[PDB]
Design a protein around this nucleic acid. Structure first.
Ligand SMILES: Nc1ncnc2c1ncn2[C@@H]1O[C@H](CSCC[C@H](N)C(=O)O)[C@@H](O)[C@H]1O
Ligand SMILES: Nc1ncnc2c1ncn2[C@@H]1O[C@H](CSCC[C@H](N)C(=O)O)[C@@H](O)[C@H]1O
Ligand SMILES: [Mg+2]
Lengths: 211, 218
RNA sequence: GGGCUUCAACGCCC
RNA sequence: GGGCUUCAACGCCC
């Protein structure tokens, strides 16, 4: 399954961008996070677990395995990361952090052999990296609920779909407003970020006959 | 929205059993859960428990299930089932701890005391219970094992075939690898959910999604 | 140098 | 005793 990148601006893919991601290294370096740095401190700006949670939730999906998914992370401090669909993200937060810390310092994680870059810090904005036919949407409890399967079917045969989800514990849905066409809800109940991710993946897997 | 428990034998509902879960306390003079990060050194020394120490998988799965609409709607209960044969019932309203460190603490305490009690309420949130799982299950309940090597199904379709008074119980192996026979003795069949191997959590979302679709949950 | 791993890097082991 | 928290218990702070 040929790998999706920001260069390919034609192919019809689904893109999820994890926004307000908490990825702030703390000099001692390790990732700043509630557990260890509860005491040191506002806990909300320090929830990298949520990101780590979603990455597993996202890369483990049938849709990524079918390579019609693309993940981006955009932290709460405006750092932008392209995730390579084929990267086998560490399963444990600890190992995750080691890696995440390194990537922030070096700006990219390279495969020990291939020329590919498993993870890369790219320059803003995110609009310069998305496909040219691409619907921009924000997830929000405070919006009209939808069936993900229905929504996906209304897309042009060429139109990709890029959803902005907040990798945060709480807060305003404004984080992507300068980019979005539309904000929508996936549920009557408020969801965790990772759950919102499953919902979309799964609805779109369904829409796209995966698999 | 009435809370579902094993005591109720009639309601139609979806049950997930996280079979083969890796929960084990660790002495050091303090207690923690046996886990591949802290104890990969030790485990190897003693020449075993190679990936028999993946409590995080259970943790992941739990968040994934309880965070799900089908849970919020009260049509889902979960059970755990340990490598070492311990069975846990999980009260559907329990706001499980978000991080693994805080999860560990609580599972270590649950294992030593056999229950976790609400500070104000007298209902338990987690409770160790007696095997077999099949006593605690609804009377009319379809039982299946999720398996990569089993016939693939569309869950929405798989569910609409259930008698209007018949529940569905799914056993997921909460583990990194292994034969999917951790439940051969209870289940009616085994099914696959994808042509790709899944992770336990993903299998779990996939299945919840499916029920949520078919049972009309938003 | 060699290895472990639902965790190329990370995190450990010899 | 009081408090914090997508984490009653847990893990922290006073
Ligand atoms: N009902 C819902 N529908 C679609 N997305 C939702 C949702 N509930 C939460 N989310 C997404 O999941 C993330 C968790 S933050 C949710 C907490 C709170 N309701 C607010 O703030 C949010 O960034 C949001 O994008
Ligand atoms: N393709 C698939 N379809 C349905 N369930 C799957 C699946 N892949 C994995 N699972 C579930 O996820 C769990 C953990 S992964 C299983 C490890 C081992 N390779 C087996 O086989 C399994 O116990 C199984 O129930
Ligand atoms: Mg207290």
């Amino acid at each position: 399954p040929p790998v999706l990148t920001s260069k390919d601006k034609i192919t019809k893919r689904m893109i999820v961008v994890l926004a307000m991601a908490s990825l702030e290294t703390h000099k001692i370096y390790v990732l700043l996070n509630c557990d260890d740095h509860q005491g040191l401190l506002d806990i909300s700006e320090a929830r990298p677990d949520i990101t780590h949670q979603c990455l597993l939730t996202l890369l483990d999906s049938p849709i990524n395995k079918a390579g019609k998914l693309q993940v981006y992370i955009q932290t709460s401090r405006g750092i932008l990361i392209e995730v390579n669909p084929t990267v086998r993200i560490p399963r444990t937060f600890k190992r995750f952090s080691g890696l995440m810390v390194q990537l922030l310092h070096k700006l990219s994680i390279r495969s020990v052999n291939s020329e590919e870059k498993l993870l890369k810090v790219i320059k803003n904005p995110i609009t310069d990296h998305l496909p040219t036919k691409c619907r921009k949407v924000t997830l929000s409890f405070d919006a009209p609920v939808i069936r993900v399967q229905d929504y996906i079917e209304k897309l042009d045969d060429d139109e990709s779909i890029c959803v902005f989800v907040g990798a945060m514990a709480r807060g305003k849905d404004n984080f992507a407003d300068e980019y979005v066409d539309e904000k929508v809800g996936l549920s009557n109940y408020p969801l965790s970020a990772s759950v919102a991710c499953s919902k979309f993946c799964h609805g779109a897997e369904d829409a796209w006959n995966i698999l």
